[model samples]
Target: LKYEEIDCLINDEHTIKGRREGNEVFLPFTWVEKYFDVYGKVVQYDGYDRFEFSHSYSKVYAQRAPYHPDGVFMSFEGYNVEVRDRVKCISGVEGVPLSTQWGPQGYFYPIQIAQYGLSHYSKNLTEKPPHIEVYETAEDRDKNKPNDWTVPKGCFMANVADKSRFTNVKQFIAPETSEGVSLQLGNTKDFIISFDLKFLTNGSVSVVLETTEKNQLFTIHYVSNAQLIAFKERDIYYGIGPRTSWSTVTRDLVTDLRKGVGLSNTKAVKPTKIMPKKVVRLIAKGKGFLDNITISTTAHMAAFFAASDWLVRNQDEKGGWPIMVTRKLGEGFKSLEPGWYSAMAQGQAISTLVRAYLLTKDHIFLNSALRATAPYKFLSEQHGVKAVFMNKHDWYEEYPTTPSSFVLNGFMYSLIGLYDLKETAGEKLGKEARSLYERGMESLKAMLPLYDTGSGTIYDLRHFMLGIAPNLARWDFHTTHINQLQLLSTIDESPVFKEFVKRWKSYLKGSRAKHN
Candidate 1:
């Protein structure tokens, strides 16, 4: 049984647990009304379109009344512990609304649920919105170039459509602190504001809130404008809608869940030399190495090696990679948040270069790594704290939009770029790059405490108390998405990073992490 097909039945509104069994809804054998209770949605919505939605985890009132045009938003609805703290849902990704932070709401799943695409009749779909696209560096084979890369189209709550903090803007976000949350007026008028959401236990949630006028906000007339909308209907076609709740797991009926592996877990065919089967298996077990979601150093290392090989083989003879290999340079552009030159993008790119050089000890690979970093010396010199303007737009500002992070996040990755160059470029050049890398690392160290690890997440704590730093949008993106890069310095053997890790780990356990 296909995992996608199996997982689909887990959240059907008609099923007992609302599980969708094949194309039809299946009710549990025990009781009939339990099925009806959850689904017999006789009249929650005044009609087909007006239903109220609470942030699943925080209980904060999130708006989804597509009938209104705020472009899908999640916001701080003053912290209420009782109404919002109800423990529901299997994944436990949600808890109760925190008095200080923004929590997950309908905004997180606009793309996954196909909300905008279904009612509005837009080109973007639940999956890779037929319209939104991906951008690759010049070397990322032109065939890999992404197009139609619009948020709400390809991703939910991305490309914030509004800016009015009180009215027109999307979700107004506040910064996070170890002690409490603070709502600071934003620079950009229309952007999402994050809230402090802690669902009892160790769980917590946060989101970026932004608004735009591009979406046609219609009035439902029946439900409150604060209701949330989700593609909870069957036959949503795209299979992009939250196919299954976070708790929705594979079924045992079609395959032995206890023994059988999942389709998503299945291996893709790759060159043996490029990825030894052992490494592939390890990645499979870890998950997200190829997908790039979860954080694992092994997975990160593998992806870097694989990408480096691909980059070397795919480079244009002119030395500069074209935006796309299959098409002309001008056609497809790549998208890396904060754009290129940021530490994150450079980290990924540089890691790959380092891996390829380490594996093959090839001078060409080293040369490529050098070339990629050489152009961005100014960015490294400024460290990630200072945004580097590539053109009229700044690559490090999370551009085209105003929300920026003076995070060592991407810059840390850039630090790796310098570290890699140091190793491959020999002494003189290595010494210079290493010194710059040291400065970059120092900048990140100062900002490290801004993230909250106790919650098992990283909140975008842009210049919260740090004064002259990136004025954060105050949303939370999974720190695990980039933790692999973070843990490098913590490892026992990394000469450049081990001691730093010791200090961090101690800080996390002691006063440092608690200081903010």
Candidate 2:
């Protein structure tokens, strides 16, 4: 059975995983139930059209983000679902919006207002907290910690009023002793929620929870009006204009490709690499992440395939590849250890490159991409099916034991490129690339679980499937990265995607600090 037995606690029944009052299903906030008080929980039924949650496989619910035409002003004027309940959801802010007393601590403490997902993190007009803590789910303590997966900017706007208030207050939760009774009310959906607590001055403080308190515990139900719109976009908007310009290229680089050893700069691979305030930085400022991506036309497709082949051939038998192999960066480019997945690192670069190539048909781009992936192919050729590349470091410091999300994508990209370039490379090479791609895809499918769209987030499940890797590990970005990437997966609007983006924008406008 998808669900097992049911248990009860404090007026709430806990099924095999009994979830009830203060328990939320599908919503991430629920994972940290005791953390906040739930007032309302609104299901987003109106936003979705074609895709709906199927109760047959698993009990699910619809969630939609609320909106305010006034945008950032709405949030500053306390137009948010939670703030609205506490204040007047009126309009018209004369000049700069008045900061709310309940504004997050991160905004005030250091007075660094950051954007959680879309806008900026605002300070609590009055005080600021000096201290803050990063939180995530207890089950997979490291799963969605405020790292690469989730934006560090997406922190709870908490104001710890007292200096010694939480100094000794350890962060942990206790199971309710109640029997079949809930302190609040909701379902049993869990999430990897996070937040930040800024300890402002000595007295007045603020607490910024990453998610809506209600979405976390199934409290009051409210919906967003401006939320739920699907627009084709790149991960970053502001500083990425020229950085993303694929048309501007020196012919010298293209000509180098025909020689079988073409090279491209980081910009050609991804302009974000060059920008200091990448999307990750923006999300941190807003306290949330947006669901958007650049259009992956034929140019992107080509780059992806070409990049895949390059990384594949370049990888060591152990599945590791150096960071950069160009004469500009040269030699020391090799990784200190397989501590992290060199293959995956290269994979990320290739995924975008090949896709870019496909969209642009710039053989120069493909040649450059192909040259880059040489490391990956070198490893695959040597290991073949024997490629059981993985590592083990320590508890709390887990990376990946086997091929990760990026590694698999790298393999797939290579195979696709081989097929695309077959006319000149011959069938033998294409055949080998195809076989490897098939095997890698099968392996990924078996291990890397596809993220459930219903969760309103995309996750890299490989860390758990394989276990920890070598060296110390950390995560601080990606869900925003992939969610944006999802837009290009196909030309369609997804309910999950729509709501995610909606809330993402709201999450940002309400905060400050400028995400990093």
Candidate 3:
């Protein structure tokens, strides 16, 4: 399950004897070891050496980087390649047209060929790849195609916008959810989605999302038309583009579809939806977070239509939230593959969704929040985020790796999320939330102290697995742990937190401030 034999072409040589794992290719130590009998058998091998590269895999023939002026570091923006050599386009990328003309891959004649004053045949608007010569060979570049640069920028423009050139258009069919019941695409109105993308020489991309509240969650954009087509019963407009761009996009209530409001055929359409006023400094915000105490019931009677809409719209069938990026934690052989779920993200979204349900008394929010809990049923190894500690307490991992990361901040957020769900969901569903919380709660009571170093707190127990020095929590994490326990103490009303918080605060001074 960990590996498979795969074919590889190393430097234009078709060597079918390589191994690959998922999206990555490996150059194993044994591959190098065989040659080292000419070198290492001439040298030696490992017990402690077995663990030598255990923390990291192996590699061969490291070269200076493209930015090192050795060039061609496989960049998105153009990179200068060595000796002005032609590199083939193996994958689809935006901007470059007729890319697969050479069949499977197309050659990118180098930028250095501009030394001869070529037209640099390109669609100049997008931050396109800078290879000036799209020609097959440096000499073939001598003859330029006049219409090569004239390919109509197939944009999603309405007959109005002076707009611009955007190539490569695709379509869409995603979702909206109803809580409690299984997931489905509902006929809801007043939601928004938009896009801004380029096509790969291999394919085109879809783009972005929104609402009146400006909660942008979109992931796609238009195909050339003054047309806005909605999927059978959804609110999004699949090909929403006026030649002029950005007229008001309106969705009709009955069709459960999107439309453009404030349109002006005789006059003109403003780019109001494209760039409206009152933007949030969203980068200042991060995850939904562990917890906080209050939700103000001010005169404003604040609505969460925007935020709650995002959660309910995206929750998957069988009721789970998903992380799209594929990655592995630094220490593991297993990866938390793309679509991997996170204990903290689920907890955080639950916390937010439940709060929205509370205010609006909306079942959609309540059900989506409840659905987020389904993944908590099993351990990280089983694709769930929970793990048994000492085969006793339950821990919700922030980074779900086998053997569990037992992240302090993450588990606390989960406990708090469950607590919020229990309080809001009530009776039937509430009990499940409560039980999940208490079990995790009990785990923390015993597990918390394991983090104490007598001088400092630690981020995790990974050192135990590696049989090495403990991974210390930096002051930021240490202090966050203290604060988390402090807040959790209020929720549990436990004196246990009081004792630990007081002692842990002393660690701020230095090692000499060690607790007894």
Candidate 4:
């Protein structure tokens, strides 16, 4: 019979035949009657020593009244359900060990019971007694004496405030005496959670509890001895300890959780204001010419914004841009393939939109920028196959071509464009865009080594067969080196790239000397 079904029959008089020596064992109808009289109807029974009557579960007897009201009951069902239900609702008389204190000499225990899921630890903001001891057996707990005990798996520990030790003070208790609590994460994924942590070592101060269903994970990194306070999702990190002049007040996670004060830490990967700040600086400070006149920084920025405005004005319904324009063809011309979509132009457009959005703090520019990078995402997958005769992953032609579609300049330009996108959105948008940028970087590093540095003037058509090799490096080729060094160095800090820059500079000088 189901547990709920048997719960209703607890008060009924029943007798059963025992398998031992043809004896009839009488049901504990009076024991059940005592619980029914005291606790109303038995809502649940373990068929063993423990029983759940009406609203409360107890061991062997129904002497103590239920301590929790319906409000507390509902809260336990939601918050403490996992641990409480597992012990009380199941066939067991024993309760989980729990205590309100941890760390130091008196609070020495391997497992520390914490409330509020995993965000139980916070900065120590008190001078009261730090730890309390818990006992499994009622005899030992009543006696308040030491006994052999081992910490269980589901316990949590807070970080010590002293910054000198890993010891932490316990705040809440979850023992086997009453109904226990759960450490398992709640079903909801969207909730704000914040913590004040003291980084003492390589371990992550805050970590996500694992779930096999959706496959999500998070880990925070910090240098030891740094006082860090941050919301798990937001870009809010403050130092409020002796390490800095910030507030050191501890946050109440449990109270905040009830009010939905903190939300889930998983963030949608999107560009933030910080990324654009650097981007605007890069674009605005960049010097350039407009209509045969070298423009000032402000005018240069104005021209950039103007171009960005025009891009939006001229954008197709499908978010694609045209490459060629003639006096006859004019603006909004659909010359090639109904409308030409250049990967190179789109890449530049992404960079432009990113900078423009950052400069103006406009979401419109950011949206368009996100739209512009769609082509790069499509082309990145083509990584073009290795033909065994080729140097590395051959870049697919933006426009359809006959033999071995590749162009070195276009490919390098695309990598830089994706890098810019990664810089803008990687932190908030999660890993999809970040992975693309990282893969492109690996390919770029591989592609750079294949520039034929030995010949000094060797820049090729990207594809080897039916393409030039060891040819005179063009001015475009020289700028490609400079651009790669500038942009690639910003992301990758390896000395090998620095060495590559030096090698290319020497080659550029060699090429210039030959031309002279």
Number of the top candidate by lDDT? 3
lDDT of 3 by residue, 1-516 (tens): 578988666568535477877888876465555532212222336533332322112111122231111111112112221112121211111111111222222322111111101111111111332222111111222256311111122212111112243222222111111111111112122122212322211121122233343444432223333233323221233342322322212211111111222222222221233321211111101111100111111101111233345457767884666665555665643666656667776776676676557657879888887888877887777778888877777888887886577777778767767877887887997777888888888888988888898876888887775566788876657766776676666567677887888777766643334335
* Candidate 2 local lDDT, residue 196: 25
* lDDT (0 to 1) per candidate: 0.29, 0.25, 0.45, 0.34
The runs of at least 3 residues in candidate 3 whose Cα sits more than 4 Å from the true structure, single-residue gaps closed, are 1-304, 511-516
Please give the range of 10 consecutive residues that has the lowest summed lDDT in model 2: 106-115
For candidate 2, write residues 1-516 as lDDT tens digits.
Answer: 243333433335432234334443333334234333222244567765343322112111121222211122112212122121111111111101112223211011000011111121111211233222233222233345333322122233221122443222112111122111111111112211112222111111011111232222111101111111111211111111111111211011111111111111211211111111110111122111111111110121122232333333444444343322111111222222312333433333333333444545656544544443344343322422124434321011012222322323233333333333332223653354344444543443343333322222233444434453311111112233232323312222435445444443332223222445
Full ranking by lDDT: 3, 4, 1, 2
Per-candidate TM vs. native?
Answer: 0.31, 0.26, 0.44, 0.35
Report the CA-based lDDT of candidate 2 relative to the real structure: 0.25
Error of 4 at 102 (Å): 75
**How well is each residue in 1-516 modelled by candidate 1, as lDDT tens digits?**
221222224345432243554567544433443432222223354546543321111121322232111121112112211122221110112111111111222112111111111111211111132221112111223244332222221112111222222111112122222211211222221111111111111211211122232321111011111222111211000111121112211111111110111111112111111111110000010001011111111111222233354456544333322221111111122222321233344433444555456657678777666655543443323323234321222222211112344444445445645665665677865675566666555555454554545322343443442343433312123322233233443321444344444443342222243335
Off by over 4 Å in 4: 1-298, 325-338, 379-400, 426-432, 457-459, 467-471, 511-516
What would the per-residue lDDT of candidate 4 be over residues 414-439, giving only the tens digit for each residue? 55555566666547752444665566
RMSD, every candidate, angstroms: 28.0, 26.5, 23.9, 32.3
